[model samples]
Target: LSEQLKHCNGILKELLSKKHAAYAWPFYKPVDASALGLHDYHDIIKHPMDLSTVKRKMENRDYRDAQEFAADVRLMFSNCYKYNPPDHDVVAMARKLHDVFEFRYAKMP
Candidate 1:
């Protein structure tokens, strides 16, 4: 687990350095942004968007937002912990995720 965390952290650190965005998004499509003008040279790189601003649109009861957030966190845990052996009770991970969401976003995690 320690080695896995070290590797993942390295990837995150390197990516964070090479990219200037708070979140990295992988994309495929739209070959042109020329309509924005020459200064907007096209690159697939996307600017990170603020989720809280959108979250506000849902008024805390947005089913879609809630479901998507849950799904994303599940994916995060699964992928992030796959290489790392479990260090704590699995239920604790779920609880921790819920606590994290409630703490960070004031919503269900």
Candidate 2:
């Protein structure tokens, strides 16, 4: 399990580097609830998640395995979808980036 944990951390590190991709930008950090004027976002997004948070959690060994990391990534996508309309550009970006992460994660060691 220790070896698997190390592998999961290494894989997560590589995955986090994808934040530079254009479609990945919106999820790179926490959403600006105040600046965006989303007063109700806090109440709506019960457990907000972002790439940076996932990275921090992974670095802190908060995730016991890859499944936990994947859950956060999924949570980030679901949060975006829940907060934005179907046709919103940010939703599209989130969908594509979520797919990118899913495909890569499916091949995890």
Candidate 3:
């Protein structure tokens, strides 16, 4: 049990150190559209993987609200998804971003 935990921790640490948007490809999951707070935007939010856009946003630390944070996540994930080939482990990237968002931004207002 302890060994498994340590292995998980190691993988988590490695993932945390990664850069580039491709790291988020595997973390995309089908969101529950109904739970999107009644916004007009549906589950299929079509933001592109514009590397320059995400890069610029990433440099700016001022996130005033959840909408901005969510937009960043979408941009980051889209960048990762498009940068990497389809053969890459999309699920892994999707899971990574999900865990990251849940851990880092879920609690924000």
Candidate 4:
């Protein structure tokens, strides 16, 4: 169980990393504004977008969201946890997490 948990954590890291890096594009090599006849103030657009710092920040935020999701799922397994006092609360929480997971990765290509 411990080994499996370690593997799950690694997978989550990779998943969120890719998600964050997805936005760090439009680099100069493939996308040149000057070549495309687009101009910016002082030719700033000619430089590649340096988003390494921004990407790290986004990945950190996403990691927090993933941690919250894991905690919510674990709560369902505990006897004290329930989405609501009403019936089938565990199913409600499960469905919510499922929807979130699907939505989070929906745009990947």
Find the candidate with the highest lDDT and give its number.
Answer: 2
TM-score of each: 0.26, 0.85, 0.37, 0.23
Ranking by TM-score: 2, 3, 1, 4
- Model 4, range 7-108, lDDT digits (tens) per residue? 434434543354433321221022344676646522432223222322343455543444443443333223212212335544444354445444543433
Per-residue error (Å), model 3, residue 88: 6.8
Give residue 61's error in model 3 in angstroms. 7.0
lDDT (tens digit, per residue) of candidate 1 on 1-109: 3343333333323333434232222111222346536343323223322223223323443324344443433444443244234674533443444344344343222
Higher-scoring candidate on lDDT, 1 or 3? 3
lDDT (C-alpha, whole model) for all candidates: 0.35, 0.79, 0.47, 0.37
Clashes of each: 0, 0, 9, 0
TM-score of the candidate numbered 1? Answer: 0.26
Name the top TM-score candidate: 2
Any runs in candidate 1 off by more than 4 Å, and if so which?
Answer: 1-64, 88-98, 102-109
Off by over 4 Å in 4: 1-87
Candidate 4 or 1, higher TM-score: 1
Candidate 1: deviation at residue 62, Å? 13
Output the lDDT of residue 50, model 1. 22
Worst 10 residues of 4 by lDDT: 22-31
Kindly indicate the candidate among 1 and 3 with the higher TM-score: 3
